Design a protein around this ligand. Sequence first.
Ligand SMILES: Nc1ncnc2c1ncn2[C@@H]1O[C@H](COP(=O)(O)O)[C@@H](O)[C@H]1O
Ligand SMILES: Nc1ncnc2c1ncn2[C@@H]1O[C@H](CO)[C@@H](O)[C@H]1O
Ligand SMILES: [Cl-]
Length: 345
Amino acid sequence: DLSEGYVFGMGNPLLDIIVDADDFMYRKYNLKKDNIVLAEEKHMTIYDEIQKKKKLNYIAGGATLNTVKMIQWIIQKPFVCSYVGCIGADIQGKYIKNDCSALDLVTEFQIAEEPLMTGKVAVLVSEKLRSMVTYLGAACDLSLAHIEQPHVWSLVEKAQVYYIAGFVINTCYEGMLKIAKHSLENEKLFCFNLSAPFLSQFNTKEVDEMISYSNIVFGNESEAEAYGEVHGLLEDTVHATARYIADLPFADGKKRKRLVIITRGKNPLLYTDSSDSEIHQFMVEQFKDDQIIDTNGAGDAFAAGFIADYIRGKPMITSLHAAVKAAAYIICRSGFSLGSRDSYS
Ligand SMILES: Nc1ncnc2c1ncn2[C@@H]1O[C@H](COP(=O)(O)O)[C@@H](O)[C@H]1O
Ligand SMILES: Nc1ncnc2c1ncn2[C@@H]1O[C@H](CO)[C@@H](O)[C@H]1O
Ligand SMILES: [Cl-]
């Protein structure tokens, strides 16, 4: 029985535009496998280009939004989760706003001044490669002033659990930092995600600072390798990274338990904490090739699945199984599609 607004999240509300991309698209825009890049000017043509293609799938995205709204979806109790993001005054943001409302996710969306449109992600799907080109758009306009509003900040004060992806470093770092400081101050549960390799590479200061406030840190193999290399962890990078992140001092220099979970695709995930001396591996659900529909958002679902159980008192191993289940459910679906709740289990 969790109170209303028990879980709070802020991030980038984005519209995923999923397309069966031709192979030349990856060479043309210099896109890499399973990677994500913020759109530069040289990428801008990709949005009108994929628009000329048939069978586009428009579906609400945003890493933080995916996770938080699935937690709300899993819990089934109305208004247990609340989300804050910046959309634009267009039909895309209206769709995202109604999508959240449809599953009882409380939202205080900031609206970017026209004509700044809501962010969009070009999800290029092919048999050989999957890659994302993200245009943040309105999501950048997410301000501290909006968060510091009385009616908006009240959602933060009532919350006992926070989830903020590393992606929000590029849009509103002062906001997520102010909340992280509040969380650690009131001994709350702060959950953070490494989100992408480029964040550890180009925003190393912000990532490490967030970790110092985080009680639970999520990451995958590529993010662990990128993080480890930047921190000079040359030998056994992935394991050394998990240990390093768990062992980092908190901001107030107090002794707390920070949980770290590194996912590794089909391979067993790793986990440990600041008290544990060992790094444990946890096996994952095995898939046949024709069973895998779309792995995009699997990591977002994993976090949702774990947190939803963990904050309800479920043991570590039990919560890990729920996390895999959430990810596996998304894998069998195209985009971050949350179907009827009755068909989950
Ligand atoms: N190919 C896969 N086979 C089985 N599980 C997967 C696969 N890809 C992703 N997952 C699940 O989603 C989580 C996150 O995946 P990843 O972002 O690739 O590390 C994993 O820990 C698994 O629970
Ligand atoms: N820069 C970003 N900020 C927030 N979410 C993102 C970003 N790039 C991709 N995503 C989202 O990540 C999800 C995949 O985990 C997709 O739904 C996509 O919309
Ligand atoms: Cl986000």
